[PDB]
Amino acid sequence: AVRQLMEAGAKGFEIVVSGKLSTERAKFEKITYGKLYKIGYDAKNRVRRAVVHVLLKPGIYGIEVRITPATLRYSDE
Amino acid sequence: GRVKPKFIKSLAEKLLEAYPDRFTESFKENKKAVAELADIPSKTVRNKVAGYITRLVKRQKAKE
Amino acid sequence: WEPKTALGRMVKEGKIRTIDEIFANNLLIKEPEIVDILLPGLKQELLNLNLVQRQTHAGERNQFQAVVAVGNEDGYVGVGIGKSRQVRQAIEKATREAKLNITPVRRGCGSWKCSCDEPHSVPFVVSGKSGSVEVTLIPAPKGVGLVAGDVAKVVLRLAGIKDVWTKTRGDTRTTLNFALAVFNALRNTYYFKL
Amino acid sequence: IFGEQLPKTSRVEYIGDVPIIEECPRELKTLDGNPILLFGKWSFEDVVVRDPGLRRYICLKPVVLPHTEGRYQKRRFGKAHIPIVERLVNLLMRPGRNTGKKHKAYNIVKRAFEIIYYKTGRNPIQVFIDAIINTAPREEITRIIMGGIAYSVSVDVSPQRRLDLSLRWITEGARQCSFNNPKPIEECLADEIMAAAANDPKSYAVRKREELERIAAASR
RNA sequence: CCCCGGAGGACCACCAGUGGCGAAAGCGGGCGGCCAGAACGCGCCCGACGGUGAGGGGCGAAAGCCGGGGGAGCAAAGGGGAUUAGAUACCCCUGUAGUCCCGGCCGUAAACGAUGCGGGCUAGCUGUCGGUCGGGCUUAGGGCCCGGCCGGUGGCGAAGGGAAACCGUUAAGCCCGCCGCCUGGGGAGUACGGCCGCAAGGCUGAAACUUAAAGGAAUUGGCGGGGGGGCACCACAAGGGGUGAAGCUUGCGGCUUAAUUGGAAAACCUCACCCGGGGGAGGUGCAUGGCCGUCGUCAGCUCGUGCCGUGAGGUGUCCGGUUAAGUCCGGCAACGAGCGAGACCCCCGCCCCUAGUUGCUACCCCUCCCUACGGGGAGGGGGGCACACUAGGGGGACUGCCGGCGUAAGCCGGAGGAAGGAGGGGGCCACGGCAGGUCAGUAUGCCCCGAAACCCCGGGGCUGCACGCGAGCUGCAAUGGCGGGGACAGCGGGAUCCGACCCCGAAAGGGGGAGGCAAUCCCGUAAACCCCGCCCCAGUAGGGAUCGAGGGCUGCAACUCGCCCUCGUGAACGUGGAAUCCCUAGUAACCGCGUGUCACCAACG
Ligand SMILES: [Mg+2]
Ligand SMILES: [Mg+2]
Ligand SMILES: [Mg+2]
Ligand SMILES: [Mg+2]
Ligand SMILES: [Mg+2]
Ligand SMILES: [Mg+2]
Ligand SMILES: [Mg+2]
Ligand SMILES: [Mg+2]
Ligand SMILES: [Mg+2]
Ligand SMILES: [Mg+2]
Ligand SMILES: [Mg+2]
Ligand SMILES: [Mg+2]
Ligand SMILES: [Mg+2]
Ligand SMILES: [Mg+2]
Ligand SMILES: [Mg+2]
Ligand SMILES: [Mg+2]
Ligand SMILES: [Mg+2]
Ligand SMILES: [Mg+2]
Ligand SMILES: [Mg+2]
Ligand SMILES: [Mg+2]
Ligand SMILES: [Mg+2]
Ligand SMILES: [Mg+2]
Ligand SMILES: [Mg+2]
Ligand SMILES: [Mg+2]
Ligand SMILES: [Mg+2]
Ligand SMILES: [Mg+2]
Ligand SMILES: [Mg+2]
Ligand SMILES: [Mg+2]
Ligand SMILES: [Mg+2]
Ligand SMILES: [Mg+2]
Ligand SMILES: [Zn+2]
């Protein structure tokens, strides 16, 4: 489910799965990429953010995805 | 303006070296040339780049 | 692939077509792509995988330390280590360093209870050491098998050795050091003044 | 002594070797050459500041009403441009129920100036300047720790700090004299300024400066 | 304290050194005598006579013991003066053994290089000591300098070795001998036996039982009453206003209670509590999602390749300058790059353009009024978009110029400039934490209540009150109170709502009702402030708690338990202990207005 992302030419993505993924204690597993703005303008306004929770056996198990496609040339050049 | 960050000086050096003859030791001509020559969608960064190219032109004339 | 480093340029241009010529003329491999070009039949195995932590103010920051052994099963072996925040790139780094550190292994007979002239065992008695694990490899008669530990057996089989007798000293439970000492002995087969 | 040039609107009055400096232009007149009168009544022309250091920070520039908008505090040493009478007005906005009541402070100062002129026959501006000169402290003490006990030690006071201390002492003496008794604040300020000008030891400012200077002389 | 004399005991300042001698312990003034042991030089003598060494010996710091002498200084024990909760210690005064000498005993020490003794081989560079040889000089000296050998003594460091620190011709390397010692920890240097000792004690030295580690070197962090640097009005300095004391509003604690609810804009409802009657607002936020707060008025975190390491890990990311910044500039086994910083996004501020159903009034005319007679003021209408305003786009400021400083990042002063050093305010909140707060916002695991949780009803309670603590309001007065008079904003809200205007009423309030679904109508002529008159230092013409009588508003309902107005009544309080909070400019402080919650009600935001 990340080679699907490399199929696209995204310069930035960030995936966070928060919950009790292995045990009864939450862990907040997260992976990320490089040139992906985190605060300011693009993030929170022009970066594709999506939060969904999935009812598994023992919890909602939140998933937050931040993506920027190959043509999101924010003001830096 | 206190200190110019990395991207300011980097853009300054690349635009000064790609076109060494389109910049002299004045600010107005420098601002005009950088607006003509680079994709500079921000007045403040354009002004900082123009001033920094002005200072390179000053030091490059001073070195000889 | 772009043949970065001039040896890679010759290897992709086909002026060097076999891996034997590099080790015959003392050529230094700086890139793994030369190894995958010249040895398409390279098998890589994950010898060890340990979790490793650094203490900080907010808690331990864990990193996987994966040890990988690469070999052609015909007298070429190498072992590499990779530390990474996640296991996949840790294994990738270990595989790349193993491919960089691949070396030829001299083989033959030499056991007193054998007479075949095949590469099934080590040609003479060799030694290797990594920290405190000392491993002496001894030529054995054909059909005996690998008489080492498990990770040593994996490294020897990848290096293309059938029978050998081992003599170890020190804590062999340090899997990284045991693997490194066995690989060190296999590389020390080339330091013998024939 | 200087090598950093100087802002314009400043003036140098070199006598002997000493470069006396004034930050404000005394010589100012209307378009017809007439003088400008403080409150329309008092002139800024004959006033003489007897302290050479204090001459640099007393802005005796002619103004009808001493009302600068509160625009000289951004820069360090900006208080040298504020007129001295407006500084007196600004130091009357206390306690907290009188903050921002510049009209009340202006009326108090105008009445005090009239009372001063009719009781002394002198220029009210001149009497106020003499009160400041007699009230400004020339020494001070500063905290020092020898290992846990905060001792004292004599130091010098810069002329700006001397002017600030004298002005604060005059205004707080007037306020304390006026609190909780039938005497009005204008009369309290008038007698305080006249006592400060005469160097009478009864005044709050003269007592405060004498106490500070004796403490400094004790803890040199 | 100074001088002049005498007596006594210890030590041998500087020179003086990883300098010397010695087997170790140990040895530091000079002269002399008697001994000892090494190094160097040698075509001297003997001819393997050597190494190590169980057992066996001899020497062996300090303290201590036995007997004698001595005793200046210091000083266990002890006495006293302090400090402390205590102080039988640490500080001060004093003080005896002891420390010194002679004879003997003791026989121990971190008695250490924690490194047994003997011999051979294995890059070097460098300080110093002794002897000797070659050259040069000469404080003409037993002197100095350079070079070689031999022998010591330090430093760095080949090969090699090591768990690593590190050793490395003074080995902990490669070898050849002999001796001593070790075999997880505790029990335990304990018990018993023996020997030695005047004694203290010493040497030698277990097991039962108990235990799963004890331990070495190094890495990251955390911490420190170790060191250094940087920064911050949630720090200090310089200041301003305060809170802490009184009365009152309010929140938590406690007490009381049927209940005073559960957590960390209240009469019904809300509501979850109590009395009575007819799916979870039940737990676990240590199961969780999301959100949020704080670390974080931070600058940090990481990666690619390389490099050091067996490894955990380092480097880069460290040093010097620089500042908001891990911002840069210059040196480095680093060279680049990325998220955070910035940039970026709104709003304020100056200029330009476009625009004038609304908003502006210069220019006009008609009317009313006044007229010192010149003229003026007010209203309606016209004309216009000039001014102002409204809104969309653009420009402008960039250390740009100058002087100084600096390799250069960049800093200070000055001009000019609407605006000068990130122009001013705010947003966006890195990686990872705070077993941070929220199953009472929604959601969800599990575990329970199971025709019982229901946002059912009626009443009460959350409003109970000895008291503690936190945040506030209005005061103590005269820079004031009261009474008249004159003003001057900006947001913002308005639908059955805002409400002009009109009438009634002393007030609160009541009746009718234009216009406005918004630059058009309305809330809306704000208060502080200025002006004039009364009060005059007093618990008062300050203060407005408490209480009595009465009149209204909302609502189904006003007692518990609402809000407003009139008349009367006039408490504490005279500026508040220890302590403590916030704040750097249109800011603090004061003043009011709109609005959120809202049938009504704001001392709150
Ligand atoms: Mg009074
Ligand atoms: Mg011997
Ligand atoms: Mg013996
Ligand atoms: Mg002794
Ligand atoms: Mg004695
Ligand atoms: Mg004594
Ligand atoms: Mg020892
Ligand atoms: Mg060892
Ligand atoms: Mg060494
Ligand atoms: Mg023993
Ligand atoms: Mg015994
Ligand atoms: Mg540390
Ligand atoms: Mg302070
Ligand atoms: Mg109070
Ligand atoms: Mg009721
Ligand atoms: Mg370095
Ligand atoms: Mg309550
Ligand atoms: Mg009640
Ligand atoms: Mg009042
Ligand atoms: Mg108050
Ligand atoms: Mg009153
Ligand atoms: Mg108005
Ligand atoms: Mg109103
Ligand atoms: Mg009274
Ligand atoms: Mg009543
Ligand atoms: Mg009621
Ligand atoms: Mg009344
Ligand atoms: Mg009283
Ligand atoms: Mg107070
Ligand atoms: Mg409303
Ligand atoms: Zn064979």
What are φ and ψ of residue D143, in 5° steps? -65, 145
Coil/strand/helix, residue C114: coil
User: Is B42 in Cβ contact with A75 (below 8 Å)?
Assistant: yes
Asked if residues A61 and A21 have their Cβ atoms less than 8 Å apart, the reply is: yes
- Sort out which chain B residues have CB atoms less than 8 A from A35's CB and list them: none
Q: Chain A contact for B39, CB < 8 A?
A: yes
Distance CA D185, CA D109 (A): 10
Distance CA D10, CA C153 (A): 92
Q: In the numeric block, which tokens belong to residue B30?
A: 């420098």
The count of C-alpha atoms lying within 13 angstroms of the C-alpha of C19, restricted to the half-sphere facing its C-beta, is 24
Q: Which of D136, D201, D139 is nearest to D170 (CA)?
A: D136
Q: Chain A contact for B7, CB < 8 A?
A: yes
State the distance from the centre of ligand 21 to the C-alpha of D183, rounded, in angstroms: 22
Write down the residue that tokens 């032109």 correspond to: B57
Q: Which of D52, D66, D198 is nearest to D130 (CA)?
A: D198
The count of C-alpha atoms lying within 13 angstroms of the C-alpha of A32, restricted to the half-sphere facing its C-beta, is 10
Coil/strand/helix, residue B17: helix
Distance CA D76, CA D72 (A): 9
The count of C-alpha atoms lying within 13 angstroms of the C-alpha of B64, restricted to the half-sphere facing its C-beta, is 5
Q: In the numeric block, which tokens belong to residue C194?
A: 């024939």
Chain E positions with an atom below 7 A of a protein C-beta are 162-164, 220-222, 239-242, 286-291, 302-306, 310-314, 322-325, 327-329, 337-345, 395-401, 403-404, 408-416, 420-423, 427-435, 443-446, 477-480, 528-531, 536-537, 574-575, 585-590
DSSP-assigned states of every residue in C9-50:
HHHHHTS---HHHHHHTTPPP--HHHHHHH-TT-EEEEEEEE
Distance CA C79, CA D15 (A): 89
Residue nearest to nucleotide E302 (CA to C1'): A34
Distance CA D117, CA D125 (A): 9
Q: Which of C130, C137, C112, C106 is nearest to C178 (CA)?
A: C130
Q: How far is the CA of B5 from the C1' of E349 (A)?
A: 27
Residue C136: strand pairing partners = C127, C167
Q: Which of C145, C149, C155, C162 is nearest to C180 (CA)?
A: C155
Q: Length of chain A in residues, anyone? A: 77
Distance CA C77, CA C188 (A): 12
Amino acid, res. D54: L
Output the CA torsion sign for D14, D19, D24, D26. negative
DSSP-assigned states of every residue in D175-215:
HHHHTTSSS-HHHHHHHHHHHHHHT-TTSHHHHHHHHHHHH
Q: Which of D64, D68, D78, D66 is nearest to D30 (CA)?
A: D64
Asked if residues D171 and D196 have their Cβ atoms less than 8 Å apart, the reply is: no
What are φ and ψ of residue B17, in 5° steps? -95, -25
Q: Which of C70, C4, C54, C76 is nearest to C34 (CA)?
A: C4
**CA torsion angle for D175, D179, D182, D184 (degrees, to 10)?**
20
- Sort out which chain B residues have CB atoms less than 8 A from A76's CB and list them: 7
N-terminal to C-terminal alpha carbon distance within chain A: 31
- Sort out which chain A residues have CB atoms less than 8 A from B42's CB and list them: 75
Q: Chain A contact for B41, CB < 8 A?
A: yes
Ramachandran bin of C192, using left for φ above 0, alpha for ψ from -120 to 50, beta for the remaining angles: beta
In angstroms, the separation between the Cα of residue B27 and the nearest Cα of chain A is: 21
Distance CA D52, CA D85 (A): 19
Distance CA C180, CA C135 (A): 10
Asked if residues C160 and C72 have their Cβ atoms less than 8 Å apart, the reply is: yes
Q: In the numeric block, which tokens belong to residue D73?
A: 């505090």
Taking CA atoms, what residue in B is nearest to A75?
A: B41
Taking CA atoms, what residue in A is nearest to B12?
A: A77
Amino acid, res. D57: Y
The nt closest to A49 (CA vs C1′) is E290
What are φ and ψ of residue C32, in 5° steps? -75, -20
**CA torsion angle for A35, A39, A43, A46 (degrees, to 10)?**
-100
Q: Which residues have C-beta within 8 Å of that of residue B18, sequence separation ≥ 6? A: none
What are φ and ψ of residue D22, in 5° steps? -125, 125
Q: In the numeric block, which tokens belong to residue C47?
A: 């010898």
Taking CA atoms, what residue in A is nearest to B45?
A: A76
Q: DSSP character for D53?
A: T
Within 10 angstroms of residue A9's Cβ, the number of other Cβ atoms is 9
Residue A68: strand pairing partners = A12
What are φ and ψ of residue D83, in 5° steps? -60, 145
Distance CA A2, CA A23 (A): 24
Instruction: Describe the crossing of helices C150-159 and C175-187 by its angle, rounded to 10 degrees.
Output: 30
The rounded Cα D22 to chain-centroid distance in angstroms is 15
3-state secondary structure chain A: CCHHHHHCCCCEEEEEEECCCCCCCCCCEEEECCCCCCCCCHHHHHCEEEEEECCCCCCCCEEEEEEECCCCCCCCC
Coil/strand/helix, residue C153: helix
Distance CA C147, CA C108 (A): 17
Write down the residue that tokens 């007196």 correspond to: D88
D86: exposed, middle or buried (Cβ count in 10 Å: 0-12, 13-18, 19+): buried
Verify cis geometry, omega within 30 degrees of 0, for the bond prior to D95.
Answer: yes
The rounded Cα D48 to chain-centroid distance in angstroms is 13
Within 10 angstroms of residue C128's Cβ, the number of other Cβ atoms is 20
In angstroms, the separation between the Cα of residue B22 and the nearest Cα of chain A is: 20
Q: How far is the CA of B24 from the C1' of E58 (A)?
A: 99
Q: Chain B contact for A75, CB < 8 A?
A: yes
Distance CA B15, CA B33 (A): 10
Amino acid, res. C14: G
Q: Chain B contact for A77, CB < 8 A?
A: yes
Within 10 angstroms of residue A68's Cβ, the number of other Cβ atoms is 22
Q: Does the annotation flag D98 for ligand binding? A: no
Write down the residue that tokens 């969608």 correspond to: B41
Q: Neighbouring chains of B at 3+ CB pairs within 8 Å?
A: A
Stated as kind and residue range, the H or E segment containing D74 is none
User: Is B39 in Cβ contact with A77 (below 8 Å)?
Assistant: yes
Amino acid, res. B54: T
State the distance from the centre of ligand 15 to the C-alpha of A33, rounded, in angstroms: 63
Beta-strand (E) ranges in chain D? 11-12, 21-22, 37-38, 42-43, 139-141, 144-145, 150-151, 154-156
Ramachandran bin of D172, using left for φ above 0, alpha for ψ from -120 to 50, beta for the remaining angles: alpha
The rounded Cα D190 to chain-centroid distance in angstroms is 14
Q: Neighbouring chains of D at 3+ CB pairs within 8 Å?
A: none
The rounded Cα D4 to chain-centroid distance in angstroms is 28
The rounded Cα D174 to chain-centroid distance in angstroms is 14
Write down the residue that tokens 């340029």 correspond to: C9
Tell me the CA distances in angstroms from A56 to A52, A62, C104, one per residue in order.
12, 10, 52
Burial letters C69-106, b for 16+ CB under 10 A, else e? bbbbeebbbbbbbbebeeeeebbebbbbbbbbbbbbbb
D217: exposed, middle or buried (Cβ count in 10 Å: 0-12, 13-18, 19+): exposed
Distance CA D59, CA D9 (A): 11
Coil/strand/helix, residue C112: coil
The count of C-alpha atoms lying within 13 angstroms of the C-alpha of D126, restricted to the half-sphere facing its C-beta, is 12
